[PDB]
Amino acid sequence: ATFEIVNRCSYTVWAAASKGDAALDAGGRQLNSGESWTINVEPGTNGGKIWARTDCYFDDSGSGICKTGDCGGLLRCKRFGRPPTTLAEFSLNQYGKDYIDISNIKGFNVPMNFSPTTRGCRGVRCAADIVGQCPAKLKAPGGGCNDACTVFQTSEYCCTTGKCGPTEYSRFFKRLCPDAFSYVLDKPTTVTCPGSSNYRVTFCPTA
């Protein structure tokens, strides 16, 4: 229920936390380089996500724009953010267990490590330089690395059938981050944790 969101990047990020229809805790906060933000998530939260936003501008009421991960121009996110966005996904207290993962299905903007701060399971990590190695057709002009579905809107990339396979692009994401979801029907890299665990999301976990 406790998530410490740490920004080890050299640049300011704007952390966001939402379960799709509502904000988790405040829903969003500015994180300068090195700052930590502890948030509390309801037990039993299904389908929550934490991500980082890049190059944000907000007014005095918390309205503005982010060049990655914008959630309707809000500082305190109540909706999911705009791709490209590296996703820390979690479902808490699901029949006794927690389930965590990192997803590149909505693209990649900032590296992250998603680890438990309590005993019982391992962490996941996507820290490679996906933005620097991004294929030309996927690069967001000011947003990092898009996913194939965001760029091309085809059944194969978006898995609207529910019977899809890997591509060039998913395979690039999976080559740079094997621990993260590259496409929808990817072999699950989901980690099972003891119910009611606590976690740390670290942006730019490495150098």
Author numbering: 1 to 207
Give verbatim lines from the article.
The helium path was used for collection of anomalous diffraction data at 5 keV for two proteins: thaumatin and the membrane protein TehA. Although anomalous signals from each individual crystal are very weak, robust anomalous signals are obtained from data assembled from micrometre-sized crystals. The thaumatin structure was determined from 15 microcrystals and the TehA structure from 18 microcrystals. These results demonstrate the usefulness of a helium environment in support of native-SAD phasing at 5 keV.
Thaumatin consists of 207 residues, including 1 me­thio­nine and 16 cysteines forming 8 di­sulfide bridges. The calculated Bijvoet difference ratio is 2.8% at 5 keV. We collected a total of 17 datasets with the helium path, each from a single crystal. Individually, none of them showed significant anomalous signals. We performed native-SAD phasing for the 15-crystal dataset. With an E min cutoff at 1.3 and resolution cutoff at 3.9 Å, we obtained a substructure solution including 9 sulfur peaks from as few as 80 SHELXD trials with the highest CCall and CCweak of 48.6 and 28.7%, respectively [Fig. 3(a)]. BUCCANEER was able to build 206 out of 207 residues automatically. The refined structure has an R/R free of 0.19/0.23, indicating high quality [Fig. 3(c)].
